[PDB]
Symmetry: D2
Subunit: 331 residues, 4 copies
Amino acid sequence: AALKDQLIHNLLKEEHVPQNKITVVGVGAVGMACAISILMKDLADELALVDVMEDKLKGEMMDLQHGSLFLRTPKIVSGKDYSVTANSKLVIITAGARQQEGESRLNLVQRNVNIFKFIIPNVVKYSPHCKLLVVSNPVDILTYVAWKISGFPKNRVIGSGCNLDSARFRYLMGERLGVHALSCHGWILGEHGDSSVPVWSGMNVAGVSLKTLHPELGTDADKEQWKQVHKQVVDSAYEVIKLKGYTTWAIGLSVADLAESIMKNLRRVHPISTMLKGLYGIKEDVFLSVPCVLGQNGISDVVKVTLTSEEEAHLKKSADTLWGIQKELQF
Amino acid sequence: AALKDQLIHNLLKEEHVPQNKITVVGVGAVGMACAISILMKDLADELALVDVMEDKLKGEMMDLQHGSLFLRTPKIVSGKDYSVTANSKLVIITAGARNLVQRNVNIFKFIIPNVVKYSPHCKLLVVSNPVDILTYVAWKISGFPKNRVIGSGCNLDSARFRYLMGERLGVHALSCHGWILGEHGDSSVPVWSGMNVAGVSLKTLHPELGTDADKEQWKQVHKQVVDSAYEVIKLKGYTTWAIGLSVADLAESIMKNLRRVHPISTMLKGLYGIKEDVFLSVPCVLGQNGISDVVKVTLTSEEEAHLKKSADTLWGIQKELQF
Amino acid sequence: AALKDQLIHNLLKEEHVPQNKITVVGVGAVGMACAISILMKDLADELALVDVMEDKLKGEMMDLQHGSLFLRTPKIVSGKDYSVTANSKLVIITAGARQQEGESRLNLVQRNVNIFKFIIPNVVKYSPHCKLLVVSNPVDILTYVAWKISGFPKNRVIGSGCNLDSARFRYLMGERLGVHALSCHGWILGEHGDSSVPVWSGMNVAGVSLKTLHPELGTDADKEQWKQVHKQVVDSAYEVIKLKGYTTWAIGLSVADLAESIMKNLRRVHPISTMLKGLYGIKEDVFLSVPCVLGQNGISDVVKVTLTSEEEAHLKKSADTLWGIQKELQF
Amino acid sequence: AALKDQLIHNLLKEEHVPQNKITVVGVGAVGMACAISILMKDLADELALVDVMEDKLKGEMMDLQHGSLFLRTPKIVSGKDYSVTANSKLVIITAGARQQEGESRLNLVQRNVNIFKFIIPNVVKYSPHCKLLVVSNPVDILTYVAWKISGFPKNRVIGSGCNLDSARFRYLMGERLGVHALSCHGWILGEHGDSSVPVWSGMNVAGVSLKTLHPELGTDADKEQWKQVHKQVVDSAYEVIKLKGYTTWAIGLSVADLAESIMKNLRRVHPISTMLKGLYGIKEDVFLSVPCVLGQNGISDVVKVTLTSEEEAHLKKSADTLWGIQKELQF
Ligand SMILES: COc1ccc(Cl)cc1NC(=O)CSc1ccc(C(=O)O)cn1
Ligand SMILES: COc1ccc(Cl)cc1NC(=O)CSc1ccc(C(=O)O)cn1
Ligand SMILES: COc1ccc(Cl)cc1NC(=O)CSc1ccc(C(=O)O)cn1
Ligand SMILES: COc1ccc(Cl)cc1NC(=O)CSc1ccc(C(=O)O)cn1
């Protein structure tokens, strides 16, 4: 008698189980950028959102849903309780607390750990086999904490690390050179942020080494000052926060790119943070960005970049600072 | 020589004239949502963003540029000076003021002649509320022929409706068809007679459809479409995602000359019993020249009178305003 | 040390299992158009091809493989042995014999059945849970046949049926009208071919009944002879064949469209062929095109279109004729 | 009143002229693969096909047309008469005469010169400002021919050159290394064919030079025999033809990638053949593959690769033999 039943004859009981499902944890400006980039790239057949801010949660979920005519991701859900995230191939974490002044690095990072003590177990319970991608800062350390708290093998716990910074360094590289970033190549590795290492030996267009053309590249004797480009990169995020109150669009597109490799098993290489104990001369349990082959199983391989000894030195110094810090956290 | 010069030999001295450029005026939640959707559908070779808050503007430009590696739109610019909108094929107006209209009219009195001076041949796509009026304002102030001035109108609301249709029937909104026309807002018309799946008229299956006696209360569905913007602002302060997607849908049809039919707001004098310079939503054919054709929807006599009611309502408001 | 091992440190042992695998059976021109349309729409993470022409089979593979820089489907495999199609989500059947002179159509039909008898049981073996999509002609019969041989439930066995006819119908509609096919709605239902049913009562633009606007629509006394539009649809595969010698592109795009709804669980409605014993006044075991909600479990519901009386008789007549062919067959 | 009139009210009585029109010359397998690849990448608002095979020409057009529901390219046209190609932004030449013997190079080539003598003038007549993209073999020679006949300036005449070959190389690379070709980088430059120059020096993953890791790379003493990878690239067109009768898909995909940089002004760098007199030591009017910046004005800049003295002389030899051939042609 109903309209649905008058119009439509049903022939198949539900058994609805998601196939390529993604969850974004945290619907702050970063998460929703991740959400929208992912939805517009068609990477999932179900997206789940989670956060503690129930009102903002339902609202974002509703806005995205009203866009369905324009999407090809048939189901969007959200909630306080993590069972809406059940059976994710990928779980992306952007949840954070924002630092007070005085607070101090250490206490800030311990509150975030406090968030992962609640957030990580819940994800793991409902998606034992998901890959985790952390974006929260500080990224290298909070990723380590996800690895520790989830009990996941290191290949399934990925840190967004220096993915966007590299993209960045390539856009600026392209601005100076006059070609598209897609065709500008360069890697920023190691610890995310100002302590990141710009591998000047690797930078090229068309396989043409720029440090060979221009031996002063990056060094302090450089008439063209290419180290300031790295600087621009490292500073560009605060600079944007300074100008619009936060950043979103780039980090989201950056995450969508990672998500695509994962969800499509592309085995592309990205500068993202992984557990590198053993490699690049690192002996502590620390996550850093190195070129990783990324796919349906997370990080499967690492490209061994030939670093100078000063670069090898840089990373080795981040491992210590990191570990020092992680050593002082309460799990 | 300089490293760029060691690396690259110039052979052509480059006449940079955008061929598929798009401008979004206003970088609030709405306009940015429009920008990010447009970038991601690969619709423009150039995007320009104009506003009046210069930091906010500069920082949105920078945030979008940083993602260039992941985009296929090679140039993104911004600034308070409208020289940056030069040569746009399409200019999207999301600017608006926190009675108002005359205030919004005042804003448009500044923005629109600027847009017209730098892109004489662009199409205007008004999104800011109150949208049927602001679209009339832009058209009047612009000097443009009417096909080149579009209101976003009932497009999104028709998207919401189909979404909700598809929740009650269990098929994707893509396969649920239903039109909302007229004044964008509480006084819009749910055209019951055209709601169908696979060409199967719901109203014929269920004549009570949309009536108060409707045991299924499909009338609530139109009310829910008319309330949802307000409901969503209530939850998260504003709305964005769905409006941006629907604007990019319109962008798409224009920049590829698809000639798709959308429920958008056009200067409909001479149609539907209407005799005023008003913009109302009707099924428009939409392409490289903006609105070029309108579908003449067959209406019940009440629906016909509801449209006339909104023409005179809109006209009455405009008669105050000064340009 | 091999260059590989020198460049890349392996951290995982992989046991590759494909997550969104699609197979196309038959690398004729229809199958290869399906193939390219799917690879360009990013619907699968692995694509496998099979045929009996082992050389044609290896050339198509390589040729696709060579386009990998431009694709996002990491893995493309091919072979005469169906081992290569294992664990497919969706298997598309474009295999078929072409006639002699000479032989009867009934006997050309049997010959195709003897191909399916060999092909279907092999697909089932390596992809028990796959959805079957049959494209080969005559499609309503061969879909039934794939159904009976497979022993699959009816939801998981889909005939491409009238989905292209309807797209053409809509394209030709928008030519007459000056609107894009996306915005013309009209349905071709029933049997694929000369006896299919243009449902005139449902033709519209923006929900405006052309029928109500013009009561002659589809009538013999129609000054505008819209009927001839149906005729063009029925004849268009033919007209195309006289001209270029086969059709490919259009059927290929339309197959990918059906593939996108399945792989993404969109639950859109398509004019496709399904086992409709029980509905539409059909008392026989035959496949006919009706509007079907199509998703990750194939056809889950169908929309019941109010047919005029002249129209029910067409479908019941088509069902009688099909059944009677189906009885003259050897499984 | 006509149904279309009852239904639609015309407001704009407007005109024609397309904004992003692309033409494909030649509806052989290569040009059609170019057609479908372009249509699924949403690169055009109008696509025109032209060829002398009138039936085949109209057949392909109609087959593409029937897929309009699924495309976002509103207008597809075809014709023996080049008025159909009017106002293209890009014109892709894939025409050619087929072998038989007595290919006194300067003869089977001479018959393609003569095909160009008819086609190019017709292209230039109706698309005065278009970009010319030549794919026909022999490509570097036929691109020069197109250049001389059209009278276009060098930036607007483009040969597909080694764009596809480098992509295959990158593909074979990713097979040896176990990453996607997207992440492997290397350049094949110079004369498209056996005499093309694999630039070993520039091969790399994530900026890490392979020839540095492994100095035998590309030499005979290479126990890994990476020299056979360049040779397998040179040969793969042949192998494929040997298997399937011709090659389509990869040349179609790569050409659509060039199309993309042009139509979007991306200024990406592609290994394509440009008129390079004055660069790379070459003093004759010839076309070679070097890294080119490709945008809305064609080839605007050229990346100067650092070459060995062997590579350089090798490029010179290709330049002098191309020229030797070009002198022997009749315009
Ligand atoms: C700021 O907290 C969150 C942000 C995003 C998401 Cl998705 C979830 C959360 N919060 C939680 O998941 C609850 S656990 C917790 C622990 C400490 C603090 C604090 O120091 O403020 C907040 N929550
Ligand atoms: C609210 O003003 C704007 C917002 C977004 C954009 Cl893109 C441009 C603007 N505003 C302008 O372009 C300057 S003209 C003007 C007139 C009145 C008011 C007012 O009522 O406060 C504001 N501006
Ligand atoms: C025409 O045969 C095929 C076409 C495409 C594919 Cl993928 C597979 C095939 N054929 C087979 O898989 C072998 S079984 C068979 C049965 C009858 C005939 C006949 O009547 O000529 C041919 N083969
Ligand atoms: C076969 O030639 C063509 C192939 C594709 C296209 Cl689009 C156009 C053509 N051909 C033409 O444009 C006609 S001119 C000509 C000159 C020489 C020969 C010959 O030596 O066989 C053939 N035609």
